[PDB]
Amino acid sequence: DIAGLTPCSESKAYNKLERKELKVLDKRLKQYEPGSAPYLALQATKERTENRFKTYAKQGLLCGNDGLPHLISDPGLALRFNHAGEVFITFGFLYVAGYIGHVGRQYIILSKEDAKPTDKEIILDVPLALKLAFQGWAWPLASIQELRNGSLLEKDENITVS
Amino acid sequence: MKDFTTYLSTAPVVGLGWAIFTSGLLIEINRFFPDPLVFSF
Amino acid sequence: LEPAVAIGGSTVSFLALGRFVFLPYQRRRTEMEVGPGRLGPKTTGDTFFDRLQKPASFVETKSKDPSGFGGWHAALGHVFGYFLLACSSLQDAGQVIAHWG
Amino acid sequence: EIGPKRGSLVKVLRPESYWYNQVGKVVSVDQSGIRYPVVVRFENQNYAGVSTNNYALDEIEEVK
Amino acid sequence: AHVVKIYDTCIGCTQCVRACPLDVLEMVPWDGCKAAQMASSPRTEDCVGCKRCETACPTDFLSVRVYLGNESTRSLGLAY
Amino acid sequence: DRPLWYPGATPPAHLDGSMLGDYGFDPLRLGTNPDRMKWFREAELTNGRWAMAAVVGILFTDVFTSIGLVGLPKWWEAGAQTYPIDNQTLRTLAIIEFLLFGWVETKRLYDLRNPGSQGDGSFLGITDGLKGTENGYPGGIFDPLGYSKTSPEKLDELQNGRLAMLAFLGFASTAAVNGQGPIESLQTHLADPFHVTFATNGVSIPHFTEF
Amino acid sequence: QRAGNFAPGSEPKEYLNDLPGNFNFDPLELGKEKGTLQRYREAELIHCRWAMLGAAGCLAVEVLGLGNWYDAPLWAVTGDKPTWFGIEVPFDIATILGVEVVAMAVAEGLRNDNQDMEKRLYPGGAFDPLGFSKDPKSFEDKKLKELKNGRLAMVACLGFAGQHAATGKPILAALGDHLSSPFFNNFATNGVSVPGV
Numbered sequence A: 001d002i003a004g005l006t007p008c009s010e011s012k013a014y015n016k017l018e019r020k021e022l023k024v025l026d027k028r029l030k031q032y033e034p035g036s037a038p039y040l041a042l043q044a045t046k047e048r049t050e051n052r053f054k055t056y057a058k059q060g061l062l063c064g065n066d067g068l069p070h071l072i073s074d075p076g077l078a079l080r081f082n083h084a085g086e087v088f089i090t091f092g093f094l095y096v097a098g099y100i101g102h103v104g105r106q107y108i109i110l111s112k113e114d115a116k117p118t119d120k121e122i123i124l125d126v127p128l129a130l131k132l133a134f135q136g137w138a139w140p141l142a143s144i145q146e147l148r149n150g151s152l153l154e155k156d157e158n159i160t161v162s
Numbered sequence B: 001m002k003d004f005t006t007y008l009s010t011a012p013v014v015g016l017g018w019a020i021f022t023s024g025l026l027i028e029i030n031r032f033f034p035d036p037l038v039f040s041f
Numbered sequence C: 001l002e003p004a005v006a007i008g009g010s011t012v013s014f015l016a017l018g019r020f021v022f023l024p025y026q027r028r029r030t031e032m033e034v035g036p037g038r039l040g041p042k043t044t045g046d047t048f049f050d051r052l053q054k055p056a057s058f059v060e061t062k063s064k065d066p067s068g069f070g071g072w073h074a075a076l077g078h079v080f081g082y083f084l085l086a087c088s089s090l091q092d093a094g095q096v097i098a099h100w101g
Numbered sequence D: 001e002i003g004p005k006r007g008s009l010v011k012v013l014r015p016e017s018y019w020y021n022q023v024g025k026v027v028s029v030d031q032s033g034i035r036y037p038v039v040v041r042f043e044n045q046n047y048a049g050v051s052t053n054n055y056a057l058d059e060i061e062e063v064k
Numbered sequence E: 001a002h003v004v005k006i007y008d009t010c011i012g013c014t015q016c017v018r019a020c021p022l023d024v025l026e027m028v029p030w031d032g033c034k035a036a037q038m039a040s041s042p043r044t045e046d047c048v049g050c051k052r053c054e055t056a057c058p059t060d061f062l063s064v065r066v067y068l069g070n071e072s073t074r075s076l077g078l079a080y
Numbered sequence F: 001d002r003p004l005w006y007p008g009a010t011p012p013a014h015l016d017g018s019m020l021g022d023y024g025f026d027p028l029r030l031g032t033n034p035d036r037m038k039w040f041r042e043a044e045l046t047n048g049r050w051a052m053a054a055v056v057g058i059l060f061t062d063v064f065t066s067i068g069l070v071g072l073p074k075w076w077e078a079g080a081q082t083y084p085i086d087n088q089t090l091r092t093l094a095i096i097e098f099l100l101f102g103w104v105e106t107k108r109l110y111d112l113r114n115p116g117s118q119g120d121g122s123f124l125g126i127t128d129g130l131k132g133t134e135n136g137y138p139g140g141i142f143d144p145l146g147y148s149k150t151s152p153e154k155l156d157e158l159q160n161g162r163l164a165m166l167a168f169l170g171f172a173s174t175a176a177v178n179g180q181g182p183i184e185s186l187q188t189h190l191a192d193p194f195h196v197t198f199a200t201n202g203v204s205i206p207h208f209t210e211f
Numbered sequence G: 001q002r003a004g005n006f007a008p009g010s011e012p013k014e015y016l017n018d019l020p021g022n023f024n025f026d027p028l029e030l031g032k033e034k035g036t037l038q039r040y041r042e043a044e045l046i047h048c049r050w051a052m053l054g055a056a057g058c059l060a061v062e063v064l065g066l067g068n069w070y071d072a073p074l075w076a077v078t079g080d081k082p083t084w085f086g087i088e089v090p091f092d093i094a095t096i097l098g099v100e101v102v103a104m105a106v107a108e109g110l111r112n113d114n115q116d117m118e119k120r121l122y123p124g125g126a127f128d129p130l131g132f133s134k135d136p137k138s139f140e141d142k143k144l145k146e147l148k149n150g151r152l153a154m155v156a157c158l159g160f161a162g163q164h165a166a167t168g169k170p171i172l173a174a175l176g177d178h179l180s181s182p183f184f185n186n187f188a189t190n191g192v193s194v195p196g197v
């Protein structure tokens, strides 16, 4: 009940929308036999809709004036209340993104220490790429240990015109 | 055989190995686990 | 409250302040600043009658570095710094400016 | 004799060249008193497509 | 017309004189390169500005430069 | 130095050098840098040293709790039962813990950067006794059993510490999928060894085969 | 001349070598330049002297029992007769404001025109009537005592501000509270000094 919003568990617009979708899906049930493939498909879609509304609700998710769930993003404001899960868990993307970056940077540096590193880019060295992909699980430790040693950057060896 | 396995390292290793793996992983995650809007905390 | 004693006791305090304790500091502080000329160009032979600093003697008349226009310049403190205190009519007009809290 | 050792990697110091602050291998150094006798060769091509250029003696520095 | 200039960083490969389609540049003898010849441009009034000489220049940076300027009947490539 | 974690085809690069409990296990090659290796061994020593005290504080009390000697709560609710007593301070334990712990943690930190950097003009009169022998291995702290000649006692220390770390991770995971204690989950494993298993008792892996 | 190490086995800064009250504390390397270090020195001395006088008066009014230090300037807003040790001075708020502006203006104007690097930190003559500056050794340890007491007084003034910012109890009362329940009443129990306590 922050930023003027209300929990999805006590909102009339949320229930109104839920019944609307359950009704528009149920209107298509009369056009088919009670035991065929379109009937089974429509029944599976109805079960998924009921489960999603139940899953979206009772999990601290709150909506505002229209039944649509809103998301709290300020840390602290999302930590003082049970709203950390909605967007404060940015560390999942940061982990996968840093994993991709560390694997690519390790492949660029290692491949450059070879005669003509070009054809190694158009024709990947798959045993070296697979070995470097499964070796970068602890990428933040390698990043902090490669920064203190100064092996992450260059001093002044850049094609500049400044 | 060496020429075929080295041919398989140009464009398929990046456009059909990773693409098929990543697409299949995200699709199977969204298939067994239905639609995820929060960390379910 | 009294306007005569709030802007009068103001003028003299701002004047005596600027003439007894802030005069050598102002003179020592204005030495690093240069005049209006664009790094000193020719003026008299080019008809620059407005940029040239006004003459009117501009020499020592008092003691320990005097002020001809400074006595009228620094004197604006009389109305800049105390006409505000002199006009403090909100202390009896109901509009409280104490800012509680 | 006046230029650097043939086959030694050097650094270019011409501020308007495509290989500024880069490292290039010296292929040959002329001994005729010309303005730019140190000829170098670089691994990476320029915008035009060439990969070699000749610099003077003052715009050639040793690598790092 | 356009102003063409030839700098001293020329190597005398004679490629700009071969690439010029209006006979503007020429090769004069010089004593500052291995080929002992440097380019020149006496027929500057016939420069059209297609910049083929700059593409034919192999040194970095280009020894020949075509600075465009005022246009005349010859430099505008008009045939009427 | 000690037996390899695998029987073969796994030769490390920076693990050839002698070290305490050297088993040659480093697949991600994290300790390649010498300074980072020297810092990671201290981190492992501190983590194992505190995990040992934590696992004994949980397991040793759980033995008497399951037998019936004491009536103390389990570890997952020992915190929820200490503060409801009438004579127990508010949540100031975290602050006094942070202050009093940071005071000695900074001494141990400045000792790693500059080994033996405890000058005479720092403490009152024990300013000379804090000169440790090696990094992570001090002398004036411990009083007996340490003036021997052969160091492989540290191997027992490191092996007990590694087993303790793995044990605490098992404590936090077993009590997260079953809601019981470690010996409470161990005693039930002795009764039915095929029924209470992580593959089928707790919701660990999605096994849905109920034909 | 290092009066103590702020951290055992710290990094010796080669800038704070021959200075009184030196502890080689500064880790942000502020004042590394030899010119700004003098301005920082005189600023520290002036702030130490002002904070010592402030903390002394702040604790003196409460130990003598004449009212809270924060509640002392509330006389102009509430509208009554202010007093100093029960004398009831008849000065208005505009009059004390004016005399304070003029007196501090002439005092600070005369202080700023010293132009003496030694006399700007430690003057003497008229500012030292007792003259305990003859003995150079006594002058040295007295200067060190001045800096050590001044820094403690600055931390004490910031403490009075924080104590009144969290709770509304007076200074001595704040001590009494800590003496009534040390493990139950401290800064970690106000609910505001730590976002989460």
Ligand code: CLA
Binding pocket: F166, F167, F169, F170, F171, F173, F174, F177, F178, F185, F186, F189, F196, F197, F198, F199, F201, F202, F204
């Ligand atoms: C050496 C430590 C150790 C020991 C003795 C045990 C013992 C036990 N665990 Mg446990 N566990 C451990 C570590 C350990 N675990 C760790 C580190 C984790 C986190 C991944 C878990 C997570 C876990 C879960 C989620 C569950 C158990 C469960 C159980 C009980 C049934 C066995 C089972 O289902 O498979 C055990 C599952 C494992 C992941 C352990 C296998 C791999 C470990 C880490 C290898 C270590 C073994 C060691 C090399 C040899 C044994 C040493 C011993 C003789 C001292 C059993 C008494 C289940 C239970 O409580 O039954 C109701 C259960 O649900 N464990």
Ligand code: CLA
Binding pocket: A100, A101, A102, A103, A104, A105, A107, A124, A129, A132
């Ligand atoms: C793994 C290689 C790699 C790495 C480590 C980086 C890293 C970086 N890039 Mg970059 N980039 C890459 C590839 C890479 N890039 C490629 C292939 C392109 C062409 C599409 C670009 C185009 C690009 C632009 C236009 C910009 C950056 C910028 C940046 C910086 C900002 C962070 C960012 O994420 O920007 C965004 C990065 C992207 C949008 C590229 C995403 C595409 C994927 C991740 C690249 C695929 C890499 C491949 C899988 C690696 C092979 C693995 C190997 C085992 C075979 C950062 C240092 C920004 C900058 O200027 O610096 C501040 C910037 O403006 N990049």
Ligand code: CLA
Binding pocket: A122, B010, B011, B014, B015, B016, B019
């Ligand atoms: C059906 C015919 C066909 C098609 C559609 C393509 C299509 C493509 N080729 Mg291929 N090629 C073909 C035949 C074909 N080729 C044949 C017969 C040969 C000789 C064996 C080659 C040899 C060849 C080489 C050597 C290369 C390509 C490359 C490429 C890609 C262009 C580069 C790019 O996207 O930017 C670049 C993109 C980035 C810098 C960002 C990196 C992230 C990317 C987007 C992820 C990769 C996913 C992939 C491109 C998308 C799916 C691929 C698709 C075929 C399913 C492109 C998708 C280039 C390539 O491998 O792509 C990188 C390249 O190096 N081709």
Ligand code: CLA
Binding pocket: G006, G016, G019, G020, G021, G022, G023, G024, G025, G026, G029, G030, G031, G032, G037, G040, G041, G042, G043, G044, G047, G151, G152, G154, G155
């Ligand atoms: C007006 C405050 C002030 C000033 C100007 C100085 C100035 C100086 N101090 Mg000093 N110090 C102060 C306060 C101050 N101090 C206080 C309160 C303490 C007690 C904690 C100390 C304890 C101390 C020690 C132990 C030592 C010094 C020393 C020094 C000298 C060298 C350090 C330096 O170059 O930094 C220059 C100073 C500044 C640039 C002032 C800038 C202030 C910035 C903006 C930080 C302020 C923000 C701060 C975090 C606020 C806290 C509030 C909190 C709620 C966030 C220098 C002349 C060293 C010395 O040799 O003595 C001569 C020395 O060893 N100081």
Ligand SMILES: CC(/C=C/C=C(C)/C=C/[C@@]12O[C@]1(C)C[C@@H](O)CC2(C)C)=C\C=C\C=C(C)\C=C\C=C(C)\C=C\[C@@]12O[C@]1(C)C[C@@H](O)CC2(C)C
Binding pocket: G025, G026, G027, G028, G029, G030, G047, G050, G051, G052, G053, G054, G055, G057, G058, G069, G070, G072, G073, G154, G155, G157, G158
């Ligand atoms: C001026 C001062 C106090 C003066 C108090 C006065 C006049 C009080 C007067 C009155 O109270 C009375 C008597 C009566 C009241 O009724 C009215 C008032 C008027 C209220 C305190 C300064 C106090 C100043 C303080 C607290 C300074 C803090 C310094 C810190 C924290 C150190 C920081 C650094 O360490 C870093 C972080 C990095 C390092 O590199 C460098 C350094 C700079 C050394």
Ligand SMILES: CC1=C[C@H](O)CC(C)(C)[C@H]1/C=C/C(C)=C/C=C/C(C)=C\C=C\C=C(C)\C=C\C=C(C)\C=C\C1=C(C)C[C@H](O)CC1(C)C
Binding pocket: G052, G053, G055, G056, G059, G127, G128, G129, G130, G131, G132, G149, G150, G152, G153, G156, G159, G160, G171, G172, G173, G174, G175
């Ligand atoms: C100059 C001269 C020279 C000549 O010749 C001679 C003559 C000698 C006489 C002189 C003078 C001198 C002087 C003036 C001195 C002074 C000092 C002061 C003022 C103060 C202190 C002052 C003061 C100070 C330090 C203070 C400190 C304080 C503190 C810590 C406090 C604390 C506290 C607190 C927090 C709170 C609680 O609740 C309480 C307590 C616990 C209690």
Ligand code: SF4
Binding pocket: E004, E019, E020, E021, E022, E023, E024, E025, E046, E047, E048, E049, E050, E051, E052, E053, E054, E066
């Ligand atoms: S721009 Fe064209 S016409 Fe002019 S000199 Fe170059 S090649 Fe010749």
Ligand code: SF4
Binding pocket: E006, E009, E010, E011, E012, E013, E014, E015, E016, E017, E038, E039, E053, E056, E057, E058, E059, E062, E063, E064
């Ligand atoms: S193309 Fe360039 S280098 Fe060659 S002759 Fe012409 S100007 Fe000289």
